[PDB]
Design a protein around this ligand. Structure first.
Ligand code: ZN
Length: 472
């Protein structure tokens, strides 16, 4: 049967199912409603940065249509909605003056969600640093971001925390470090060879450190000032794609483990154990910032749950570890990616070249966190796949590959949960086809189709699949 034995009865009691978007990717009204620009506004408005020079100015226009979108998600039997607040929509300059019209938008959204019985899971940050903060402070290169982010977070707790009980600080700081400061393909486009300046060997580590210190400072503020009255929780969202050793050799097993440590351990070892992974300390050395004992104690235990964005998996091949001139965070791992074993591809690709459809990667990731980190509370905060551009409406709606994607990946998650992993919920990326960063509107991740000419929403087969799977 097309559900493949899945239903709410197949998951733990009170397991949360939702969908996810992010502010810049769906809201629109990017330069209206009093919103100040983010680094993504400047980046997307520069010719050649985004596919077809597209941008998020209008996006899906959720800003005007949110009640339609909330009605839709309720009709699809979801319990929760993960969305983000645009920092520059609240503080156009990232600090100082509050944009009251911005505040009102999020009040209206949160209240309508609650009126419809959908639980808000709110991200404070999703790639969208206020441009004014980038210019004035140097953004995530500056340790002062902890203070600035904490004040922003403080306002959000005060203003929305009587209603919002599930918070996340950041979304995938590894991708910010990697794409913004290693490869220099996302804003602020920094890297060793980059026009804007940078150093791919040092800056990604500075940036990650500052994300961890900022997260810890925001959570400390929540716990000391708001928690007693509000009784909510604050986590963080981390990307984790699976790495499988290409063979059972010592070298290949070591490579796969290195990759895990540089990918997820980079953030999880500080959050769980109060230090960076040993292998990163050994290889990256004086390029890896040191937490003081006080900072390490602030960072350790500072996430009430771990959000994991899980999409894909790779084989890893190893080598003897070399002494090497440092060139980048990516090269520091000393691994070789491989996408076939025994002459067979790890899986077929979706539209995005990096996204190999590998359902057992979900089991791999969830099992690994369970076994390595003392089984912390995990929420799958994003999982999904994309269709390409230029299909007809009907072709988008008959998304049988995505139906197969969710059934297979959710079966693998169920497998990990039945073996004892503490997973509290699951969120599909995305509710809507949206602005997919560098791919612009050429990548369609939604379970709901969006006609980007008319802005009309049309549920795809995968939306109906969720509706049937999730019926109460
Ligand atoms: Zn509109």
């Amino acid at each position: 049967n097309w559900l493949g034995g899945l239903s709410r009865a197949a998951f733990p009691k009170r397991f949360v199912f939702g969908t996810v978007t992010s502010a810049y990717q769906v809201e629109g009204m990017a330069a209206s409603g009093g919103r100040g620009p983010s680094i993504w506004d400047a980046f997307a408005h520069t010719p050649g940065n985004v596919a077809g020079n597209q941008n998020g100015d209008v996006a899906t226009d959720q800003y005007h249509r949110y009640k339609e979108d909330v009605n839709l998600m309720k009709s699809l039997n979801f319990d929760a909605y993960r969305f983000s607040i645009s920092w520059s929509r609240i503080f156009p300059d990232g600090e100082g003056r509050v944009n009251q019209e911005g505040v009102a938008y999020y009040n209206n959204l949160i209240n309508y969600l609650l009126q419809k019985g959908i639980t808000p899971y709110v991200n404070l940050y999703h790639y969208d640093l206020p441009l004014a903060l980038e210019k004035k402070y140097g953004g995530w290169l500056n340790a002062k971001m902890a203070d600035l982010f904490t004040e922003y977070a403080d306002f959000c707790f005060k203003t929305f925390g009587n209603r919002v009980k599930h918070w996340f600080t950041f979304n995938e700081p590894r991708i910010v470090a990697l794409l913004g400061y290693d490869q220099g393909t996302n804003p602020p486009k920094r890297c060793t060879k980059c026009a804007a300046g940078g150093n791919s060997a040092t800056e990604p580590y500075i940036v990650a450190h500052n994300f961890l210190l900022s997260h810890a400072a925001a959570v400390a503020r929540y716990r000391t000032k708001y928690q007693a009255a509000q009784q909510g929780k604050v986590g963080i969202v981390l990307d984790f794609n699976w790495y499988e050793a290409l063979s059972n050799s010592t070298e290949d097993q070591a490579a796969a483990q290195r990759a895990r440590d540089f990918h997820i351990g980079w953030y999880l070892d500080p959050l769980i154990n109060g230090h960076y992974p040993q292998i990163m300390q050994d290889l990256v050395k004086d390029r890896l910032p040191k937490f003081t004992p006080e900072q390490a104690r602030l960072v350790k235990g500072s996430a009430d749950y771990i959000g994991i964005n899980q999409y894909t998996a790779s084989y890893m091949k190893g080598q003897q570890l070399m002494q090497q001139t440092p060139t980048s965070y990516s090269a520091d791992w000393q691994v070789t990616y491989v996408f076939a074993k025994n002459g067979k591809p790890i899986g077929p690709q979706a539209n995005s070249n990096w996204l190999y459809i590998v359902p057992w990667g979900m089991y791999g990731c969830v099992n690994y966190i369970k076994q390595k980190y003392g089984n912390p509370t995990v929420v799958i905060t994003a999982n999904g796949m994309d269709q390409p551009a230029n299909l007809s409406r009907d072709q988008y709606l008959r998304d049988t590959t995505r139906v197969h994607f969710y059934r297979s990946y959710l079966t693998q998650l169920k497998k990990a949960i039945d073996e004892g992993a503490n997973v509290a919920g699951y969120f599909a990326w995305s509710l809507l086809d949206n602005f997919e960063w560098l791919s612009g509107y050429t990548s369609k991740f939604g379970i709901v189709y969006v006609d980007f000419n008319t802005l009309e929403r049309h549920p795809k087969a995968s939306a109906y699949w969720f509706r049937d799977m999730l019926k109460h």
